[model samples]
Target: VLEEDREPDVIEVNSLEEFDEIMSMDILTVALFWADDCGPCKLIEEPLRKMAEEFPNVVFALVDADKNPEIVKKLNIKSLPTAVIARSGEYLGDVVGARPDLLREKVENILKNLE
Candidate 1:
């Protein structure tokens, strides 16, 4: 049986309103912008899931670049598979491409500094 109150490790940002709501939360968030045809974007899914598990406090969001043009333009996402890290609506940094190692490192450093 499934847990009665289990929150998802990753949140799917389908609309601009949803994106804004998540960004406004008082917590750390890692929003990954990806496209349907992006190979590198698909490659990072498993690793991203693992990261979400490791950092339960951090909110991991997946945004379909093709579907969310408004968010893409707002973030100035020029490339596929871009990971934007933010805290309470403030942009911190971003990692472009499928570099799981770099992503993990960045999150770790940010978490440490947040202490």
Candidate 2:
């Protein structure tokens, strides 16, 4: 199920420039690369929403892989439901595929290490 009513912390980016702007900021970015038609991609939102609340400083940017082909290719996204983290244009790491708690774990673990 999706939170259709709430305005999530996620910023939806359609252009590579916007993507760069978000990454260039002095903040941690937890981006989800997904497509509307992708079922598994939709399923990852629950965890994303939860994580956003916990990490308010992190920018939860959503990129529609289908809509932004150039951005997707630029980020090297080959599949749906890829959870990626970045800091000031640096690719921190990625959690590929849909796992129950991959986003939470990856973010928490990486932030701990990044600290």
Once fitted onto the true fold, the runs of candidate 1 whose alpha carbons sit more than 4 angstroms away are: 1-7
What does candidate 1's lDDT look like per residue over 1-115, in tens digits?
A: 2234344688788899999999989999999999999999989988998999999989999998888999999999998899999988899999999998899999999999888
How far is 56's C-alpha from truth in model 2 (Å)? 1.0
In TM-score terms, which candidate is top?
Answer: 1
Which lDDT tens digits does candidate 2 get at residues 7-86? 56767786888989988887889878999888898778777777788877689988888778998888778889887889
Instruction: Report every candidate's CA lDDT.
Output: 0.91, 0.81
Best-fitting candidate, scored by lDDT: 1
Q: Model 2 shows how many backbone clashes?
A: 0
